[PDB]
From a paper:
The archetypal Type II [name]+ protein [name] (N-ethylmaleimide-sensitive-factor) plays an essential role in eukaryotic trafficking through its disassembly of different [name] (Soluble N-ethylmaleimide-sensitive factor attachment protein receptor) complexes. After fusion, [name]—together with several molecules of an adaptor protein, [name] (Soluble N-ethylmaleimide-sensitive factor Attachment Protein)—binds to the cis [name] complex, forming the so-called 20S complex and disassembles it in an ATP-dependent manner. [name] is composed of an N-terminal domain (N) and two ATPase domains (D1 and D2). Here, we present higher-resolution cryo-EM reconstructions of the 20S complex composed of [name], α[name], the full cytoplasmic regions of synaptobrevin-2 and syntaxin-1A, and full-length [name]-25A in the presence of ATP under non-hydrolyzing conditions.
To improve the detail of the reconstruction, focused refinement was performed, in which all but the [name] D1 and D2 domains was masked; this approach yielded two classes of complexes with near-atomic resolution (FL-20Sfocus-1 and FL-20Sfocus-2, 3.8 Å and 3.9 Å, respectively). For both focused FL-20Sfocus-1 and FL-20Sfocus-2 reconstructions, the spires and N domains are weak but faintly visible in the unsharpened maps; FL-20Sfocus-1 appears similar in configuration to the FL-20S-2 class, with N domains from protomers B–E engaged with two αSNAPs, while FL-20Sfocus-2 is more similar to the FL-20S-1 class, with N domains from protomers A–D engaged instead. Given the similarities between these classes, further discussion will focus on the FL-20Sfocus-1 structure. A pore is formed in the center of the hexamer, with a highly conserved loop (i.e., the pore loop, 294–296, YVG) at the center. The [name]-25A N-terminal residues are present within this pore in an extended conformation reminiscent of a β-strand with side chain density and close packing with [name], enabling identification of the register in the density maps. The presence of the [name]-25A substrate leads to remodeling of the pore loops, with a majority of the conformational change arising through rearrangement of a highly conserved amino acid residue, tyrosine 294. In the case of protomers B–D, each tyrosine Cδ1 atom intercalates nonspecifically into every other space between amino acid side chains of the substrate and is engaged in a stereotyped hydrogen bonding interaction with the nearest substrate carbonyl. Here, in the FL-20Sfocus classes, this loop is present in some subunits and packed to varying degrees against the substrate. The nucleotide occupancies of the D1 ring in the FL-20Sfocus-1 and FL-20Sfocus-2 maps are consistent with a structure poised to disassemble substrate, in which protomers B–D are ATP-bound, and key amino acids are in place to catalyze hydrolysis (despite the absence of Mg2+ under the non-hydrolyzing conditions of the sample preparation). Nucleotide densities associated with the D1 domains of protomers A and E are ambiguous.
Author numbering:
A (entry chain C): 208 to 457, 468 to 738
B (entry chain D): 285 to 458, 465 to 738
C (entry chain B): 285 to 437
D (entry chain H): 1 to 17
Write the structure that this text describes.
Amino acid sequence: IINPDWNFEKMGIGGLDKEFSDIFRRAFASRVFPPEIVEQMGCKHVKGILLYGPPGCGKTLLARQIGKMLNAREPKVVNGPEILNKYVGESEANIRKLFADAEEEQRRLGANSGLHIIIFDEIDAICKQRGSMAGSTGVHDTVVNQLLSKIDGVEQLNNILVIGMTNRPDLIDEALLRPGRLEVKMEIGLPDEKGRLQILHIHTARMRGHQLLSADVDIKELAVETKNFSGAELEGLVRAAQSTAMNRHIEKAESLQVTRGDFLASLENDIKPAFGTNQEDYASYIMNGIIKWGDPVTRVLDDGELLVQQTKNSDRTPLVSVLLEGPPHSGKTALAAKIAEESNFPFIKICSPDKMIGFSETAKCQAMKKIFDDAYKSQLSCVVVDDIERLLDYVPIGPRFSNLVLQALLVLLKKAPPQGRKLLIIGTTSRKDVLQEMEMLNAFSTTIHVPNIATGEQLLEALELLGNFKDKERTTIAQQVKGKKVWIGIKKLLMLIEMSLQMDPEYRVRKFLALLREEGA
Amino acid sequence: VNGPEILNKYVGESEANIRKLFADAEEEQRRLGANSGLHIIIFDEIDAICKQRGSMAGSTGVHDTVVNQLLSKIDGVEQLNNILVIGMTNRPDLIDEALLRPGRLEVKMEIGLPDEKGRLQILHIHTARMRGHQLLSADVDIKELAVETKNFSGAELEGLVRAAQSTAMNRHIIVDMEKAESLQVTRGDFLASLENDIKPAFGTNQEDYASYIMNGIIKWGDPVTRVLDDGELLVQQTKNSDRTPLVSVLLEGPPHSGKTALAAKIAEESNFPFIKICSPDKMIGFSETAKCQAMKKIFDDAYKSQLSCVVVDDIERLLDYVPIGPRFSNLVLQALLVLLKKAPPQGRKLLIIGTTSRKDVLQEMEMLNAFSTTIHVPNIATGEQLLEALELLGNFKDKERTTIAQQVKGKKVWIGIKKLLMLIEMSLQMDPEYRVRKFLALLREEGA
Amino acid sequence: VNGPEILNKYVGESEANIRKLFADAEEEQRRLGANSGLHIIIFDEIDAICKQRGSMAGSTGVHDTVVNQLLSKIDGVEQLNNILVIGMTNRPDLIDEALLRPGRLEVKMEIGLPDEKGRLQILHIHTARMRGHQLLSADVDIKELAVETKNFS
Amino acid sequence: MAEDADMRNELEEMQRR
Ligand SMILES: Nc1ncnc2c1ncn2[C@@H]1O[C@H](COP(=O)(O)OP(=O)(O)OP(=O)(O)O)[C@@H](O)[C@H]1O
Ligand SMILES: Nc1ncnc2c1ncn2[C@@H]1O[C@H](COP(=O)(O)OP(=O)(O)OP(=O)(O)O)[C@@H](O)[C@H]1O
Ligand SMILES: Nc1ncnc2c1ncn2[C@@H]1O[C@H](COP(=O)(O)OP(=O)(O)OP(=O)(O)O)[C@@H](O)[C@H]1O
């Protein structure tokens, strides 16, 4: 009896217990069977695994492990192109130099044969869609026109599985992807927490069997505290853990002692950024935090918490859309960030004009589209648009804007992700009237008016909070504000505070109030 | 021969591998003139090896011109009889037509996707052995499949079959051993349906209406029936009549009425061979030129069939339209408005829908004049109509139904569904007493 | 490798000159896996060789096949545990996160216009060779030079 | 520019018989 796999207990993998089972049944069940029933069946073996996903998610690992540890052969591997050559025909010929040790082998051993494997990698480089390839005719066209000719070729070789892998699967030709040339198109993606901890269990098992690790590390906490890590990142987390321990442990004068890993995640999660959320993106936009000056802030961020809980819980509203109106210099983005920071959804990338400058609207809308397509990977997410009227160019005078970015924006607001996923799209603006005029406002599912500070009462209690002005001088500002109304927003306030502060103390408050006369007026 | 397999670097070896092909078949011609054993050649993926001589971009080599040797060999000065040669190509249009003219290659035959009933032959021809050796239950219905596969072709048809045998094995297949059990009694039974759903993509995707249809269709009164009847009375226009091979419909209504959703409903109810939804969702950031080319390609492949339907959703977004000031892209408009009144060749029937939230923009752009007809989608106008709708939905119990029902009928409602869902939802999330009060208070401002 | 040396008019030679680098290390890793010595590689300019391959910067970047080959080579199906590649940019943002992610290049560092202490140490370095031979001992205030020089590089 | 041309060329065999 011939079985190509004597042992795999578990190999180098966690989180994929679905995907490995699917790929296994599809492409190794025909292999592992009684032959008699399969020739009763009259079925031809599936070949042609493809693996498409984002980077750092463990695809070439999988291909490596199956090919070289699961079944008995040595696989021929092309690293990117190895193929291409300066001479015509020899590039193409290297393809058949791959297949020409298994073709005759099948010819002269019949059905039963030792399996041959080919692992392509970065296959999108060698193969791309014809007619759009490097000009009209294309340079890369005959390698692919041979490859298709061989894989399903007239010889009907039955003895190979081709394992491709990509980060850009749309490039790959449907002609090559139809069943039998590559049968299985398999997404592998950012793991869920239980798979995520499996990763850590694996990479820490060899460290755990030995007692170097310290008892204070419960990896479930680490699962909670790295949400989206691909696992290529996660090894790096562990790897730099070991490194910090070693440096703690030591011209060089390495002092020879026995060492223990501890506080890895706590120390260096702050170091490494990720494909998913950051802790640090927030402190840019909220530098001062959010001080509570009244019931308005309660109302606003409670509505936000309420709404994210709606999205999390409910179905038949896969997406929601909100925007925050305020007058200018009434913080919109602070609220919009703190909402997400309290929502604890796993994926947040703010889309802001500030990181896009000088960009023509084409590459602009491609960027926002990239963000939303990244977000559609995860199971749920919160995306912030801010300063919309500057995101899409806007001026009142002879009114002008980019049409393209507008339409891309609001179709995305009206767009649904693949089912089961859920998100909210938060937006900000200082004006919603022009948005009514361009009829994108209806697309936003709901709005929140952010009020602006209306009362010297709210002002002076905010100043109790900030603590910049003490009570003695504040007695004067009380007598100034009482009975009068104020329109100023706090982001302008927080300028006025220091603008007055830098004067001498005697003229301090007099300048402050005489200045504040201008805006309240 | 595989397609480039001829090609080699040394300047004359490319042609000198072709003459190897035809030397036998001309030598036996010479020796025996009248007859021979019919040495036949099979080219494969011929489009690469032979394409038009006058394009060198990317090649920078003369070896694009092996073709001259080829066709100067095939008929040549020396006629060669008792040879057969067959080309095979995905891409038909790049071939130098010097060898498409009759007598070098006679026939241009185009194999299209399988027809619905021929697909049954395609299915039964594979399952013959599976049934003859009694690995097939009598419950599975190949016809139930064959109607349930819209665009499955060939390998795509065989993929569910091959997968089904695998999924049926895998149970009996099963750690360190990974034992293969001995049990040989099995058959895949109604797991081909499951795999038909999940595992392959069709390769031409209409499978997902879900993004368009979240809730199906709540049948909420007489108007929805009136609409669906007008539509399925209109669909018969194509199928019956050959003097109106093209028909064109508008769906006119206010926003948030699910017009583009029930368009998909009527499409799937028409059950045509080729159906499509041209979305602005799929096309984003595309400049007006590419936005025209995509639509162009859609209608072009739709013409291939003996009939088709296509819907165009949110044309006001598709051709980018904003007032503040009139502004839009014109080329997409021109393309669309030509295509409405482009009659397909020789009664290959077409149906078109478009949807808008605005007719007042369109009647000056002269688009609905081009459309054959238009049908209105009225949206819910009253408390009774609304209450029937939400009791079809659920998610208000009888006390809440009444609690609303007291004070609705005295009032007049202008609402639409796509808003109503969000209203009931966000009001619902609040605590139980608060739920209906909030729903109400939202409706106070929204429907007024 | 100093900037591109690689890029060649002909197809495939621009990937041959790339894998030329690492083939010297591959053989050694295979012969001795465990205890082999490092082959360090030093890219003076990364950004010119590899810029984003995402069908951006024109058609498929510029000759993005190079970066395909590279990120296939260093993190490829062979382990290749025996090298670290140095890379250096004054234009970092172009580079693909696929390449910068942990394991192909884990560590991205910023070096920035130094504070007074660094701007002292660097001066003391460039001056110690010359003082040790007692050429200048004259009334030269180093702290004063440093604090006079605000941002210099 | 924004020019990528990648090209190939062919051999002229020497006579060593
Ligand atoms: N279960 C796992 N899931 C994800 N990554 C893993 C897992 N186990 C180990 N890894 C680490 O992930 C790293 C990268 O994954 P892999 O080697 O497949 O290349 P990759 O980053 O997936 O390639 P690409 O960036 O092109 O997707 C591996 O080098 C390995 O160290
Ligand atoms: N509770 C709060 N609510 C709103 N803003 C706050 C709060 N606490 C602090 N802030 C300050 O408000 C500022 C908000 O600035 P923001 O990002 O809103 O600019 P902006 O107002 O959007 O700009 P523009 O006025 O042009 O729209 C932050 O710098 C933050 O320090
Ligand atoms: N009888 C019905 N007619 C129309 N839509 C319905 C009906 N019953 C339910 N719906 C719901 O309508 C929803 C689709 O609304 P949709 O977003 O398509 O409205 P729309 O007019 O396209 O919005 P917009 O004008 O913003 O594009 C679906 O979830 C569907 O379940």
